[PDB]
């Protein structure tokens, strides 16, 4: 509000706790109209004889400085926590089952989502095996048990189960030809606290 809106900007995530309908790209447009609204003034006195070098500007440098500080680092949070939440649910699953929407990508988050997924992919390749076994870490915790049956669920949406099935209808009663590698993604992003 004079450098406070991020309290509102992550309020995009207000209901999106684990009862999340979906998400969007809020809180950038008018606010990054600032960054070019202001450099004009911040560099208005640039190498000027308008004061011939005295004490007078010394806040104004700092005015620019703090404006930018707030701007950039607010933004750092604005992507950073998004990486964090998506990373959490992506510890609940690979990029098999992508984001709820893939429409709340604030454009440069192309770079960011893909970068994070594939930095981690690289680290994966190092991990697991020297060649790299992307090694199951946070899902499908069946000890040695059945391979090919379907089960009961608790009403998922997103519909992202491509794996090996014609249509398994990844919701409650996603009950079809389900193999093991079909059902290899979701454990606690909202389904099978109950078979």
């Amino acid at each position: 509000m004079f450098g406070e809106k991020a309290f509102d900007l992550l309020k995009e995530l207000e209901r999106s706790s684990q009862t999340i309908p979906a998400f969007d790209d809020d809180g950038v447009r008018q606010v990054l109209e600032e960054i070019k609204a202001i450099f004009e003034e911040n560099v208005a006195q640039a190498s000027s004889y308008n004061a011939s070098g005295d004490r007078s500007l010394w806040p104004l440098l700092n005015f620019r400085h703090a404006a930018l500080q707030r701007n950039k680092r607010c933004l750092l949070a604005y992507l950073y926590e998004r990486c964090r939440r998506i990373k959490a649910l992506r510890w609940e699953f690979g990029p098999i089952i992508p984001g709820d929407i893939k429409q709340a990508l604030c454009e440069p988050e192309v770079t960011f989502f893909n970068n994070y997924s594939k930095s981690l992919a690289a680290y994966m390749c190092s991990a697991g095996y020297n060649q790299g076994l992307p090694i199951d870490l946070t899902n499908n915790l069946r000890p040695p048990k059945s391979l090919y049956i379907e089960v009961r669920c608790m009403e998922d949406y997103g519909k992202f189960e491509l794996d090996d099935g014609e249509v398994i209808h990844l919701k409650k009663n996603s009950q079809h030809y389900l193999p093991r590698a079909q059902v290899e993604s979701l454990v606690r992003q909202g389904i099978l606290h109950h078979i």
Partner: protein, 567 residues
């Protein structure tokens, strides 16, 4: 037996637990336990009907070979039901016993647990499918059909003097070359005297659903106290020898006590909190001795009431007079039995059992069990089951049927109990809402005889009586109600019907059949009896339940169907 066949059970399966029942859940949760024990993942199922079943299998169009259904089976030659079954292993364990023979035979995809003192239906297949009359599975004198079909050499084969089998008598002609058909029909119909004795006159239930299952898991060295209690629940549902029979009560006093008493894992150190091994005592089917006062719960059960006729005042007068001889205080008769003082609430049953011998009631006391989890309170034998039936809560959300099932099966744990008191409460309010209609309907004289039976119809929907369990309960409180006091001793013995409005379902006028009085073993005609009018005129009838004694009609397409169904 499956001390051998259970050793088949390792691969994939589907465990279906057919339409709502207390046999169902008690019999199945144990097996869920068993099966996540030997590291198997499997499938439990809600069943909404035979169509729910058929779509369910349709949704499970794999080759899960170890298919399992329990407490069902008598619907078809179920290979006709379930065509793609090729050698798939099914398992039937149903106590709805009057089951088809084609399901028994065809030792391919079925489990004939045929064990019974009735060797009465042996050639029941040896003439209906094995013989036939005026048939096409045959040859002709022409040379175009010169191939031997599935020649049973019987009536199933030709009737034109072409039957290599059927070697009891002459060949060309007995009195004529087609007296084959004559004797075929002789045996056919003279023993449809016994086929129509099966499945087209009467139905019943048999044995347990899950006490056999207890003995199964007993042979694998499990002393699960809770499994004794769950099976107790499964039986005490239709232990109600007036509802559907136990019989073995005085024989299970040996059986189950022998299961549990003789193996005493601790004879000296059991005075502990958690799950102090089950006990046994002789107590009542008085509804809810424990958490309520007397004077409301002395009033909503039928058997205590009908013999002493309390929905009129005078019953209360004699009631008070027997509280007098009992000397209970009225305040104490209106505080919860546990909320009473001590000595009265100890000596209560101690006196009541012997000085109710002399005043019109003989058949209230039973033999059952009860136990603690801890120090909260001492739960009761059936107050689960009468909390369960109150969970069939057909709300308009469309999820609540299956959800209430899933809730119920998640109830009988020792964990989830905040809901169990909920079930008690819901049960009580319904239990005295039962009574709330009887006075209205009796003394409005709604007892429509209409000939050979008694008959009820109702007008709009109650959330009590949307579903039919409450409906059978209505019919089974009024019936005693009316027939105590309005009759001579001649006509107390005729059956009963009852309409059941469904304002929900566009107008269908549901019905339930129920039987005349005091004949425990002589049970329902209504395994088929309603279907007569279904043949005679026949209008949009249903028999969807594996429960037989039920239908579902249109709102108004019943009365003429009833006039046909007079006889």
């Amino acid at each position: 037996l499956r001390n051998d066949f259970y050793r088949q059970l390792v691969g994939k399966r589907i465990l279906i637990v057919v339409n709502y029942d207390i046999d169902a859940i008690c019999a199945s949760r144990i097996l869920q336990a068993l099966f996540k024990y030997d590291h198997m993942l499997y499938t439990v199922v809600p069943i909404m009907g035979v169509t729910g079943l058929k779509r369910a299998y349709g949704e499970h169009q794999g080759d899960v070979k170890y298919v399992v259904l329990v407490n069902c089976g008598g619907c078809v030659d179920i290979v006709e039901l379930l065509q793609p079954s090729d050698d798939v292993t099914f398992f039937i364990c149903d106590s709805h016993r009057p089951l088809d023979v084609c399901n028994i035979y065809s030792d391919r995809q079925v489990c004939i647990l045929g064990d019974a003192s009735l060797e009465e239906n042996i050639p029941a297949f040896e003439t209906i499918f094995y013989d036939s009359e005026g048939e096409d599975e045959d040859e002709d004198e022409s040379s175009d059909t010169e191939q031997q079909h599935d020649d049973s050499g019987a009536g199933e084969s030709d009737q034109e003097d072409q039957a290599p089998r059927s070697r009891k008598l002459s060949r060309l002609e007995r009195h004529e070359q087609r007296i084959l058909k004559q004797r075929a029909r002789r045996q056919w119909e003279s023993e449809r005297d016994r086929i129509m004795f099966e499945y087209t006159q009467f139905s019943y239930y048999g044995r347990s659903a899950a006490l056999m299952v207890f003995e199964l898991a007993w042979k694998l060295s499990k002393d699960n106290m809770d499994l004794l209690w769950w099976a107790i629940v499964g039986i005490t549902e239709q232990l109600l020898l007036g509802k559907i029979e136990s019989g073995a009560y005085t024989l299970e006093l040996e059986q189950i006590q022998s299961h549990v008493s003789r193996l005493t894992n601790k004879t000296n150190d059991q005075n502990t909190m958690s799950a102090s091994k089950i006990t046994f005592e002789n107590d009542l089917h008085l509804v809810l001795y424990r958490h309520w006062p007397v004077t409301e719960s002395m009033r909503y059960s039928r058997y205590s009431s009908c013999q002493l006729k309390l929905w009129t005042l005078r019953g209360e007068k004699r009631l008070h007079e027997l509280l007098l001889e009992m000397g209970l205080p009225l305040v104490h008769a209106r505080q919860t039995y546990g909320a009473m003082d001590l000595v009265l609430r100890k000596e209560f049953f101690s006196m009541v059992e012997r000085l109710a011998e002399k005043y019109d009631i003989a058949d209230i006391v039973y033999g059952t069990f009860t136990l603690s989890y801890g120090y909260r309170s001492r739960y009761a034998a059936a107050d689960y089951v009468y909390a369960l039936l109150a969970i069939m809560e057909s709300v308009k959300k469309h999820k609540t049927p299956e959800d209430c099932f899933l809730e119920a099966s998640d109830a009988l744990s020792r964990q989830h109990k905040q809901l169990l008191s909920a079930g008690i409460d819901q049960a009580k309010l319904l239990h005295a809402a039962v009574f709330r209609q009887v006075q209205s309907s009796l003394e409005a004289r709604q007892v429509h005889s209409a000939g050979s039976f008694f008959y009820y119809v109702l007008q709009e929907e109650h959330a009590f009586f949307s579903y039919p369990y409450a409906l059978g309960l209505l019919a089974r409180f009024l019936l005693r109600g009316h027939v105590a006091t309005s009759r001579a001793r001649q006509a107390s013995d005729l059956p009963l019907i009852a309409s059941c409005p469904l304002n929900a379902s566009e107008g269908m006028c549901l019905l339930v059949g129920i039987v005349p009085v005091r004949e425990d073993s002589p049970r329902n005609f209504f395994g088929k009896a309603f279907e007569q009018a279904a043949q005679k005129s026949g209008v949009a009838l249903l028999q969807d339940f594996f429960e037989p004694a039920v239908v579902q009609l249109r709102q108004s397409d019943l009365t003429r169907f009833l006039d046909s169904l007079t006889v």
